[PDB]
């Protein structure tokens, strides 16, 4: 089997991407944030505290003839931005782009933090990291990809995120028309439950490539590119007027600037992030100070190849017995 679904930016900055997901019988379609940095599929629901729902589409398990309460199961998660959610769990039929999994754990939110309430466009998350990170207790549950894997033509999914444009998540096959050149594969460590890999280095603009190992995670659920302070300083030093602002919470730059590209290494191959991709717009409405898309990871504990990086590539998440990651230009 295979599946193929279009993923669409939630706003003009590509802050996140949503992909329609069919849950239950008859189908209830919710727009979920596909997140390769977490492993829970959770949704706004009929059980979510009323004051915490503001425009989202909800899953109502009582209206699904295939929903079953997973007795005694609860979940609670927090993300890198400090947001969180928690609730109970149902199993139900879940389909993505024509690919159907029965008995998928659908985690129903009883509580969500303010950042979720405040974002009307995201109805929940669909985790695509390794199932070892799944938060369901007392019986940990498998991700949608893990449940689908054995049925897929090939045990892979691909992320093809657009810049200010829709893109595609495919399951079970590699669309050879979707990228240029070849896909370079690189080793993955699953020890932390993430798609963790080691970039071979970087360049800033037309500058020389610096060979240096940068461990990090491929994370579709993080907007920006978070890298070591040395690397990030080297990037922003090429932008007149750019500075790290403690009050804003990262590097900012004059909105009048033309940003240089940033290249990262994947083995001997190179992925080029165009400078425009690194512009996240005014820090507040009407400001001439713009927020940078490359930021320091120093306060996080891990480097994160978020959407800014991933959307410059066609990315293969290879879930074979020994997982690997593939990157191609496009």
UniProtKB/Swiss-Prot annotation:
The keyword Signal applies. GO terms for biological process: proteolysis. The active site is at 35, 199. It catalyses: Hydrolysis of proteins with specificity similar to that of pepsin A, prefers hydrophobic residues at P1 and P1', but does not cleave 14-Ala-|-Leu-15 in the B chain of insulin or Z-Glu-Tyr. Clots milk. One of its GO terms (molecular function) is aspartic-type endopeptidase activity. Keywords: Aspartyl protease, Disulfide bond, Hydrolase, Protease, Signal, Zymogen. Residues 17-328 form the Peptidase A1 domain. The keyword Membrane does not apply. Belongs to the peptidase A1 family. This is Endothiapepsin. It comes from Cryphonectria parasitica (Chestnut blight fungus).
């Amino acid at each position: 089997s295979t599946g193929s679904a279009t993923t669409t930016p939630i706003d003009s900055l590509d802050d996140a991407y949503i992909t329609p997901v069919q849950i239950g019988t008859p189908a209830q379609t919710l727009n979920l944030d596909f997140d390769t940095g977490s492993s829970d599929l959770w949704v706004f629901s009929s059980e979510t505290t009323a004051s915490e729902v503001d425009g989202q589409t909800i899953y109502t398990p009582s209206k699904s003839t295939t929903a079953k309460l997973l007795s005694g199961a609860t979940w609670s998660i927090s993300y890198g931005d400090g947001s969180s959610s928690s609730g109970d769990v149902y199993t139900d039929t879940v389909s993505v782009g024509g690919l159907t999994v029965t008995g998928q754990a659908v985690e129903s939110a009883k509580k969500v933090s303010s950042s979720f309430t405040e974002d009307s466009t995201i109805d929940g998350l669909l985790g695509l990291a390794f199932s070892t990170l799944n938060t369901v207790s007392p019986t940990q549950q498998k991700t949608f990809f893990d449940n689908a894997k054995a049925s897929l033509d090939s045990p892979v999914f691909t992320a093809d995120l657009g810049y200010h444009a829709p893109g595609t998540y495919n399951f079970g096959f590699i669309d050879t028309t979707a990228y240029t050149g070849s896909i370079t594969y690189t080793a993955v460590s699953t020890k932390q439950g993430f798609w963790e890999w080691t970039s071979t280095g970087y360049a800033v603009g037309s500058g020389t490539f610096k060979s240096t190992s940068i461990d990090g995670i491929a994370d579709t659920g993080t907007t920006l590119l978070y890298l070591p302070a040395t690397v990030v300083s080297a990037y922003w030093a090429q932008v007149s007027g750019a500075k790290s602002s403690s009050s804003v919470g990262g590097y900012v730059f004059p909105c009048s600037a033309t940003l240089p590209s940033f290249t990262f290494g994947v083995g001997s191959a190179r992925i080029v992030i165009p400078g425009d991709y690194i512009d996240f717009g005014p820090i507040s409405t009407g400001s001439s100070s713009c927020f940078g898309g490359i930021q320091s990871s120093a306060g996080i504990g891990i480097n994160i190849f978020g959407d800014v990086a991933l959307k410059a590539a066609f990315v293969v998440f290879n879930g074979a017995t020994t997982p690997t990651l593939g990157f191609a230009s496009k």
